[PDB]
Design a protein around this nucleic acid. Structure first.
Ligand SMILES: [Mg+2]
Ligand SMILES: [Mg+2]
Ligand SMILES: [Mg+2]
Lengths: 152, 152
DNA sequence: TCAAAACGTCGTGA
DNA sequence: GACAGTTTGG
DNA sequence: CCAAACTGTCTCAC
DNA sequence: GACGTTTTGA
């Protein structure tokens, strides 16, 4: 469980607040018990000409990867354990996205317990609803209310 | 002549690298001896719903102001003396915009010299060219060579 | 004749 | 920036 | 059944 | 984000 230097986190927290995104998602998939996946992503987006900055991030955070879409790239961190360790440390330095971050940690910690009850799975889906409410979200489709219907 | 806190600077450098802009412009203006003004701007842009963040910048930096344009607002610092002092302290923490910041610092120092000599004035204009070359620049119009013409 | 503020908008890079 | 829909392989 | 990866795009907020 | 044009005020 990696310790990150505070100088790294202060800078990163400011950059993340600007160009980064903290994302909670409910993805319909029929292979899943509740017929949806809970997905959690930390990402930093940057123009591909600046990709080196994202590649350095991978080296610094020590986990995650960069993905290319044309003129733009993203650092992506998905795996739950590293994500928790990293967001825990970054959270206190965030200003704009700090609420989002603390909710993700909550969703993560409750994730096992949410695969039992349709009820707890919903309670956690409303937290997703919350993170989306904080983000500037124009494109969203699947919500805790989507899940609600399906479960009935 | 304010000394800024290092934690404040580290975070802000990150944010600036993400959402900020270090801008140099040659503004054609007929009231000027060389028929152009040399203009420097440090800005941070954010959605107006987040304007509180920008307001806190004014308080923290101690100088500058917030402007509104539609759905979006900007922290603006154009005052050359405060600007020099601020950027001098921010620059070593900048990863993406550090060269721009240094060019600005160099322009500000050389500005009195620029106002005497058309040759020196043109020289400083080439430094602003180099800032635009570093920024993701699209709508740029007036350049050092545009100035050179008018001078002849 | 200047420094700074005020106002306005393209082309993305988030 | 913040999603979407789809595939993979234990 | 699941975590995680892979792949694509809409509407801005820079 | 990164420019543009125009006006203000010593
Ligand atoms: Mg931003
Ligand atoms: Mg941005
Ligand atoms: Mg950026």
């Amino acid at each position: 469980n990696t310790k990150y230097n505070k100088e790294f986190l202060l800078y990163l927290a400011g950059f993340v607040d600007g160009d980064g995104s903290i994302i909670a998602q409910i993805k319909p998939n029929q292979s899943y018990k509740f017929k949806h996946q809970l997905s959690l992503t930390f990402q930093v987006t940057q123009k591909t000409q600046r990709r080196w900055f994202l590649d350095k991030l991978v080296d610094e955070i020590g986990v995650g990867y960069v993905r290319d879409r044309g003129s733009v790239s993203d650092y992506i961190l998905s795996e739950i354990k590293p994500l928790h360790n990293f967001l825990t440390q970054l959270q206190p330095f965030l200003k704009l996205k700090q609420k989002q971050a603390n909710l993700v940690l909550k969703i993560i910690e409750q994730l096992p317990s949410a695969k039992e009850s349709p009820d707890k799975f919903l309670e956690v889906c409303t937290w997703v609803d919350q993170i989306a409410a904080l983000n500037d979200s124009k494109t969203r489709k699947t919500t805790s209310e989507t899940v609600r219907a399906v479960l009935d």
